[PDB]
Design an enzyme around this catalytic site. Structure first.
Site, PDB file in Angstrom:
ATOM      1  N   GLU A 240       8.820  21.027  13.420  1.00 46.64           N
ATOM      2  CA  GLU A 240       7.853  21.938  14.018  1.00 46.64           C
ATOM      3  C   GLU A 240       6.460  21.342  14.126  1.00 46.64           C
ATOM      4  O   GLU A 240       5.698  21.750  15.005  1.00 46.64           O
ATOM      5  CB  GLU A 240       7.778  23.241  13.218  1.00 46.64           C
ATOM      6  CG  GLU A 240       9.109  23.986  13.137  1.00 46.64           C
ATOM      7  CD  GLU A 240       8.997  25.348  12.484  1.00 46.64           C
ATOM      8  OE1 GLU A 240       7.891  25.696  12.035  1.00 46.64           O
ATOM      9  OE2 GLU A 240      10.015  26.072  12.426  1.00 46.64           O
TER      10      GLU A 240
ATOM     11  N   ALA B 210       0.815  -1.209   0.000  1.00 47.61           N
ATOM     12  CA  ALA B 210       0.000   0.000   0.000  1.00 47.61           C
ATOM     13  C   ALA B 210       0.846   1.254   0.000  1.00 47.61           C
ATOM     14  O   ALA B 210       0.407   2.296  -0.485  1.00 47.61           O
ATOM     15  CB  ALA B 210      -0.919   0.007   1.206  1.00 47.61           C
TER      16      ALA B 210
ATOM     17  N   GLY C 271      -2.388  -4.591   5.698  1.00 49.83           N
ATOM     18  CA  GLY C 271      -1.665  -5.786   5.322  1.00 49.83           C
ATOM     19  C   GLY C 271      -0.867  -6.443   6.425  1.00 49.83           C
ATOM     20  O   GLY C 271      -1.099  -6.208   7.615  1.00 49.83           O
TER      21      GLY C 271
END
Ligand SMILES: CC(=O)O[C@H]1C(=O)[C@@]2(C)[C@H]([C@H](OC(=O)c3ccccc3)[C@]3(O)C[C@H](OC(=O)[C@H](O)[C@@H](NC(=O)c4ccccc4)c4ccccc4)C(C)=C1C3(C)C)[C@]1(OC(C)=O)CO[C@@H]1C[C@@H]2O
Ligand SMILES: Nc1nc2c(ncn2[C@@H]2O[C@H](COP(=O)(O)OP(=O)(O)OP(=O)(O)O)[C@@H](O)[C@H]2O)c(=O)[nH]1
Ligand SMILES: Nc1nc2c(ncn2[C@@H]2O[C@H](COP(=O)(O)OP(=O)(O)OP(=O)(O)O)[C@@H](O)[C@H]2O)c(=O)[nH]1
Ligand SMILES: Nc1nc2c(ncn2[C@@H]2O[C@H](COP(=O)(O)OP(=O)(O)O)[C@@H](O)[C@H]2O)c(=O)[nH]1
Ligand SMILES: Nc1nc2c(ncn2[C@@H]2O[C@H](COP(=O)(O)OP(=O)(O)O)[C@@H](O)[C@H]2O)c(=O)[nH]1
Ligand SMILES: [Mg+2]
Ligand SMILES: [Mg+2]
Lengths: 110, 432, 430, 430, 432
Positions: free
Chosen positions: E245, E12, E134
């Protein structure tokens, strides 16, 4: 005059209990529907996947098979189309005559 | 500026509005694409590119009349988010457009309105177009007027009712709609205009010399009435009027708020000659019993508050001379407790003719919005088209079987029979 | 959207249907194969209401064809405009009803209704949002009524909130093409006043007189009667699939029409009706087409309109015309005939104006009348029933299929209930 | 990598594979000789999973063909796609099992399996990384039931950690094609519930009806049943050798599916299933292909899905499509069928979408379902076993080959163990 | 001089990453050959010739989807040392991608990362693209996040976790992958981004008018969210925000660090017209329940911290104007302990479009990364897709047989049920 008794019998016996595994279980609730005269019946699932667990009724809300419910514990609203034979969602939130089924919170089951 | 949005509920509203937004594009050089070869910012909200889109929510349960908008000339104008379709219409059944089907898609309606009230810094009011006849025009309007007034409260909401005729109807349950779509939208509606089909068929015949009025032709006239009520926002004249200004002048009581329309001049191209149509001639074409576009007899009641809205080249001396004749004429009567009850208004723009239409190029016009007493007898008639179809309890078995009480029909007539006496409260004089 | 499933039962309705789909194909430019060749895009703007687009750009009719012997279906599959149907839908038995009502609802129907209703359930799921179920049958046969009254007792249980219209051919006063057809129709009204929203009572006998007198035909074949009934059958649902000026559809043709949930027996009318050469003698105007309609000789039901009063009227028009001409004439024929229209329904004409004519005409009128004029039809058959039951002739062909004398008095009591209720709301004036 | 070794056993399996390797050679473009002539480079990117490339650019199938008499092999070698196999791998005996289970596992099994496992040991070494052992046999014969239950009890000893799929043809309810096939099955089920990880129960009896009803065939030969079984057989492992949008291999179709180490019996299905002329009547889209799958008449196993509930359900799609449609349709058939699916397994659809269709289609669903619907298949056979054991008929051909009543009670206890466990995890709700 | 590197664990991620580095080459003129006809050194380390190679380690147990990268359009770009393949896959089994097979090749992975931490004088952050669905993407990451944190400890480690949908799932043991892979990542994750498929399918349907979205098309959208978080390194706007940040602005606690992303505007080529998409218009397009790319109702919980990574021609007056509307609106709630919870970022890059795509060419955009309370109810759901498949002890036998204890599942759940009340720790208001 009007009622919802032919609709719910068409909804119980053909959508969520039509399999012959729960065929004794379907007869174990069909005889508890003929013995009431409620003008508005309503069905409460547990999941969004509409697993059937309990049968209720509405007045213009008692447990035919939580006992009483209010308008706070309601989350979704299902309308059973006789066309598609599948509980479709309702954008409206008011519990009314077209409202065929509903869900509640997951707080109420833990 | 002073922005105003438009909702077109029902088929009778939309087919008017197909000619309405056909008409402002004639008055502002607007292409069907939204192009054009800055005071008109009220019925539009343009693009960063050169393109203007309207303020329109063409909403309908059945998809049929919508699908001609998306194929017509005016496909390239409307935002394709606006045009709302649905599954099945209410189909002349009030219990379906308010309880069953219109309840389903009411939230898609108000949210697209919600994305139109944000663009308007100075939002003025609404222009809802509907009938009293159809189930889409009745149950879905009274559904919508309740929800917008709770949302806002402090705006001006104007209905444009295609009124049910006393004699010529194209429906069977048309009295069973209108008592329901007046009881429910009595509080929320604010200035509901009555326009009848039947009296327009007269004016198509006599004053226009047309014996075959297509609805292409009927809706040009109501477009001219709408394009002159709102002529004073899109243009500046000498003595202007606003949508908040109407509702104080024309409405003397919280109940009685049903004006009716009359437009003049309505003449063909051949009869543009043979008379001169002065500012004191077209004014007499307003107070006749002939041109009153509701089939009522204005000589069978009084005028509480007439309202004249002229346009084109009119000189403000001549109006006062024209009015002073009229208040002295005898058959025209005014209400005794209202001393002098007019409201003038002059815009600097003439009416413009739609090409291929059926009116002549005139230099002036008048769009009279009078609040008479003569509509009371028509309210004393639809209850008699109601009770004869109720003592035998006919047609009740369709309303009841879609979410409606039997007890909520004698309740509506009880409000409607109460609405008759307030017009009769007007006609009397509290003599000291 | 608003799709309609078309079920064809009996020998009658299939031969109606084989001309019915022959009619709809020419309104949309449909070949015998199933592909499009028409010239107006409005033919495909609402093509999905009776069709499903198959692969390769073919259309198949959404039509289920029901029989109990392969005799009629073999004719349809041999003929033109017959191979276009889906061969899964030809649900037919083998044993034959034999013009026995109790055989096609108890004996032969109970083994074939299961293989109908799944093919019913297959067609409904292939639609966007379903509107109604049009059925085409008789009230005299065994297949068109035993299988006819069975499905509505099953489909309304599967579909409690759709509209069910049956285009039932009604037995005639003069000729009796079946010896026992009073026994069939009395058992059919018991299962059509309880479950269907509207019913289109068309006769054979007055259908020839429209062919003989007005049309000036020498040899009326059934291919010219069902040619004519298919015009009304399509004319009702042309306002649902084409943009009219003032639209109506099958639900608007229910609430306008039917004042009481039993009195829903309609009777059509059509116009223009010309001859092969006598078209020169008239003009085609809405004041002309209106007065052709309200004659005694244009109502296809075999009853005099003057013997009884009307309740509601839906004259669905077609073709491009105006609206005042309609609205004047619909007013005009009520003022001079206010004795025929009942008192307690003011403005009892439902106008419907479409914009598409029939293929090749200029205009057309599809009248739908609801009258007290068929109180004597249910006084006719219920009198032909009673004398054939006091001697109880032809009873051992129905008792042998599992049926008692108890049932046969109820349907006689049910129809004589309907005799009084047309009588009750005919003279009740206030 | 991920190579798979293909063993074939019995008369049944040695004819399925001759159609199975006939199937594969058209997906990759392989001649009868053994060389490449196809058009897409994707054919040869994973050609090495069922093949070894020998010298000269020839490819030979990694397939081992086992028998006990030279009758079936001679048919294979004479026919086309028969010379393409390695002639060393035809490991067979001469006695013939004679449709006798006790002869092909105890007597003739030990005299040939030594020449089998060495060939198994030879074929595994020609691989990169081995995946599994697909196998083709029955549960009614004597060879395919006895030799096949011998190998897996030996090959699992040689390979404790590879996957073992057997494509077993299962005996029919109606026609008992073998006199003693209730004795072959229960002795074969004893060696499939304890060694194999998945077992593709395919029936003959429901396979005929699909050839008659859906496919509309008049003369169904075995060359048109195994032709159909091979379509499922290649559809499972077309995602292991072709680049899919959602890849699934033989291990992903183990852990998603099998909930418990015993209940691993699968019953497949396939779509589309057209006719020779009825292909023009539908739409070839995922909303049709989904609902073609879940009928009772698409399950190749002779059992009703409506009797019993599913647990985990696979659906390996082929051909280029979109993922939302599949995600919608796999969602759609659980909400309207929530009774049919078990509660304590939510999201009980496993999906796989590959990018290569079958050779000549547009899309195809290869279904693999798991169910409680095969409790009666092991209630049918476990009852035909019992009545043929009380009078203990047909026993002197098994006792004579070294076998006791002790074994015939344990396997009867073994299968009734499995009757309880499709019952235990069918009503357990929470 | 600030360099971030990227890992692509599982299928994926790799299919997404084929579209990410497809998209980075569109913003720089980078050819597939690495040719080009200087601030882009964050995602590249060029050669002495004319060639740029990316900072990417594509890792996969199964050798399948990598082979389409080596044959695809981007063959001539990646260094063939980077593309680490393997023998067999974990096959949707956490106990295989973490104990059995992924344990083997982990030294080949960490060493090729090790040869990329030396080309970076300004090593900044990690990007583990993976799914919770998965077995590789959930097992190998949980191995890999433990190893990079012991290696470094002091670098930002951003994941992009595909979240498992509440209604549509293409896996059966998927609630067994996810509850394991959050417990393992929870000590070592730094800020884990959530994306669901199911909420994109609405946004593919409604706002885009596509009924058939391919995984070509879903991965275009998640690429633009990636290509705007990382827009404030490759380019300089008026207000830039680094990956060091985000971890302080968005993250209120060491536990709750699960933002859900939202991108706007997402409109088709035809609906690109008919509206103007102002800097106060596209902001309201983000705070709807419609546009959230995770299927959780945002009106069922409060926003703790948002972050509006604007880009394109946005002028910073109107942002302060638009935010001042939003904090005053009613349904949008902020938490009682956070005073005002935004973090504005303006960059000077229009979002450039991939050719052959299905988004419009817009001139401004917003990649909202809005932490909330609303995702807590989905954590009250994946434990309920867990307990029903565990009280009957289903599917345990594939994880026991691959090196996992039985007790080390209920150990994870009670740790995961402890994570539920930490959102209930947020929802309360410690008054006085
Ligand atoms: C050259 C020309 O214009 O010829 C006409 C024609 O001459 C006339 C005489 C036709 C003709 O009708 C008949 O002769 C007739 C015969 C038996 C029964 C009924 C009618 C026509 O056949 C019929 C036909 O009607 C149609 O095409 C309509 O679409 C009609 N179609 C059919 O009935 C039909 C016929 C055969 C095969 C398939 C369909 C229709 C009407 C209502 C609803 C749907 C369809 C028309 C205009 C013509 C001819 C060819 C001569 C008339 O009828 C109709 C129904 O239109 C009879 O009076 C009208 C007036 C027409 O002008
Ligand atoms: N002036 C005018 N009136 C129209 C037009 N079309 C229809 N009407 C009137 O509309 C009334 C019927 O109600 P409609 O509003 O059209 O029906 P509807 O609102 O679409 O509701 P449905 O019952 O669902 O169809 C009648 O009085 C008609 O005269 C038109 O083009 N112009
Ligand atoms: N958005 C998106 N999700 C994808 C795509 N491909 C797969 N997925 C999702 O990834 C999840 C399955 O994870 P995979 O990465 O395929 O599995 P894996 O980790 O590689 O391990 P294996 O089981 O060995 O294949 C499912 O939820 C899929 O929907 C894609 O292109 N885009
Ligand atoms: N209009 C019309 N009536 C028909 C036709 N065929 C049969 N009928 C009538 O149908 C009746 C006989 O019923 P039938 O349907 O054949 O019997 P069934 O097959 O048992 O339903 C008689 O009144 C016939 O006049 C036809 O083609 N058209
Ligand atoms: N599907 C299929 N079944 C077959 C075929 N040949 C035999 N069978 C079945 O196999 C069973 C007989 O087993 P068989 O394999 O011939 O005996 P064995 O050689 O001792 O294993 C019967 O149920 C046959 O229906 C075939 O070609 N296809
Ligand atoms: Mg309407
Ligand atoms: Mg993978």
């Amino acid at each position: 005059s009007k009622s919802n008794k032919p609709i719910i019998h068409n909804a119980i016996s053909h959508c969520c209990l039509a399999g012959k595994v729960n065929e004794p279980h379907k007869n174990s609730i069909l005889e508890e529907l003929e013995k009431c005269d409620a003008n508005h019946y309503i069905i409460l699932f547990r999941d969004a996947g509409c697993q059937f667990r309990a049968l209720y009724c509405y007045y213009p809300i008692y447990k035919l098979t939580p006992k009483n419910i209010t308008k706070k514990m309601i989350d979704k609203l299902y309308k059973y189309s006789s066309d598609r034979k599948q509980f479709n969602l309702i954008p409206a939130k008011t519990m009314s005559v077209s409202v065929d089924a509903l869900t509640i919170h997951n707080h109420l089951w833990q | 500026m002073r922005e105003c949005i438009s909702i077109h509920v029902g088929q009778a509203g939309v087919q008017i509005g197909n000619a309405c937004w056909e008409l402002y594009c004639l008055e502002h050089g607007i292409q069907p694409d939204g192009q054009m070869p800055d005071s008109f910012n009220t019925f539009f909200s343009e693009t960063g590119a050169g393109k203007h889109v309207p303020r329109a929510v063409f909403v309908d349960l059945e998809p049929t009349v919508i699908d001609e908008v998306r194929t017509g000339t005016y496909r390239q104008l409307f935002h394709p988010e606006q045009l709302i379709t649905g599954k099945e219409d209410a189909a002349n059944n009030y219990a379906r457009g308010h309880y069953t089907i219109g309840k389903e898609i009411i939230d898609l309606v108000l949210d697209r309105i919600r994305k139109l009230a944000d663009q308007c810094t100075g939002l003025q009011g609404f222009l809802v177009f509907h009938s009293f006849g159809g189930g889409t025009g009745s149950g879905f309007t009274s559904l919508l007027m309740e929800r917008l007034s709770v949302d806002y409260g402090k705006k001006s909401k104007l209905e444009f009712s295609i009124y049910p005729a006393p004699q010529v109807s194209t429906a069977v349950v048309e009295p069973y709609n209108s008592i329901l779509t007046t009881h429910t939208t009595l509080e929320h509606s604010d200035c509901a205009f009555m326009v009848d089909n039947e009296a327009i068929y007269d004016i198509c015949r006599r004053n226009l010399d047309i014996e075959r009025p297509t609805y292409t032709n009927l809706n040009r006239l109501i477009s001219q009435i709408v394009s002159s009520i709102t002529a004073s926002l899109r243009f500046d004249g000498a003595l202007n009027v606003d949508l908040t200004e109407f509702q104080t002048n024309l409405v003397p009581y919280p109940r009685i708020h049903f004006p009716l329309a009359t437009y003049a001049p309505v003449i063909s191209a051949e009869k543009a000659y043979h008379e001169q149509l002065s500012v004191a001639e077209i004014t007499n074409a307003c107070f006749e019993p002939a041109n009153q576009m509701v089939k009522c007899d204005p000589r069978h009641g009084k005028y509480m508050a007439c309202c004249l809205l002229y346009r084109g080249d009119v000189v403000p001396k001549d109006v006062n001379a024209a009015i002073a004749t009229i208040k002295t004429k005898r058959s025209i009567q005014f209400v005794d407790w209202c001393p002098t009850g007019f409201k003038v208004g002059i815009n600097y723009q003439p009416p413009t003719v739609v090409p291929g239409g059926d009116l002549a190029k005139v230099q002036r016009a008048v769009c009279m919005l009078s609040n008479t007493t003569a509509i009371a007898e028509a309210w004393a008639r639809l209850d008699h088209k109601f009770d004869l179809m109720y003592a035998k309890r006919a047609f009740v078995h369709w309303y009841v079987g879609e979410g409606m009480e039997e007890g909520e029909f004698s309740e509506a007539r009880e409000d409607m029979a109460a609405l008759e006496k307030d017009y009769e409260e007007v006609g009397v004089d509290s003599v000291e | 959207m608003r799709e309609i499933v078309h079920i064809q039962a009996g020998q009658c309705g299939n031969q109606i249907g084989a001309k019915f789909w022959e009619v709809i194909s020419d309104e949309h430019g449909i070949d015998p194969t199933g592909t499009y060749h028409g010239d107006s895009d409005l033919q495909l703007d609402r093509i999905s209401v009776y069709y499903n687009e198959a692969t390769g750009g073919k259309y198949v009719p959404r039509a289920i064809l029901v029989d109990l012997e392969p005799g009629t279906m073999d004719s349809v599959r041999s003929g033109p405009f017959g191979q276009i149907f889906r061969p899964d839908n030809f649900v037919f038995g083998q044993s034959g009803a034999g013009n026995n009502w109790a055989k096609g609802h108890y004996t032969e129907g109970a083994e074939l209704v299961d293989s109908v209703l799944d093919v019913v359930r297959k067609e409904a799921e292939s639609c966007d949002c379903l509107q109604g179920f049009q059925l085409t049958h008789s009230l005299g046969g065994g297949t068109g009524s035993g299988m006819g009254t069975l499905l509505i007792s099953k489909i309304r249980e599967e579909y409690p909130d759709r509209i069910m219209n049956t285009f039932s051919v009604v037995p005639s006063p003069k000729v009796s093409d079946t010896v026992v057809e009073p026994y069939n129709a009395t058992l059919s009204v018991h299962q059509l006043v309880e479950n269907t929203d509207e019913t289109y009572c068309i006769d054979n006998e007055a259908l020839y007189d429209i062919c003989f007198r007005t049309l000036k035909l020498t040899t009326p074949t059934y291919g010219d009667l069902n040619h004519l009934v298919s015009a009304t059958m399509s004319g009702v649902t042309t306002c649902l699939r084409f943009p009219g000026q003032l639209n109506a559809d099958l639900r608007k043709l229910a609430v306008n029409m039917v004042p009481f949930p039993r009195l829903h027996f309609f009777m059509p009318g059509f116009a223009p009706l010309t001859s092969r050469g006598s078209q020169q003698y008239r003009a085609l105007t809405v004041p002309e087409l209106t007065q052709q309609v309200f004659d005694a000789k244009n109502m296809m039901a075999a009853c005099d309109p003057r013997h009884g009063r009307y309740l509601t009227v839906a004259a669905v028009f077609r073709g491009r015309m105006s609206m005042k001409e309609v609205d004047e004439q619909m007013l005009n024929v009520q003022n001079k005939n206010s004795s025929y229209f009942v008192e307690w329904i003011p403005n009892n004409v439902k106008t419907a104006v479409c914009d598409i004519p029939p293929r090749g005409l200029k205009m057309a009128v599809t009248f739908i009348g609801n009258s007290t004029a068929i109180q004597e039809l249910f006084k006719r058959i219920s009198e032909q029933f009673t004398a054939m039951f006091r001697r109880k002739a032809f009873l051992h062909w129905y008792t042998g299929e599992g049926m008692d004398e108890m049932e046969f008095t109820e349907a006689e009591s049910n129809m004589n209930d309907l005799v009084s209720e047309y009588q009750q709301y005919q003279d009740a004036t206030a």
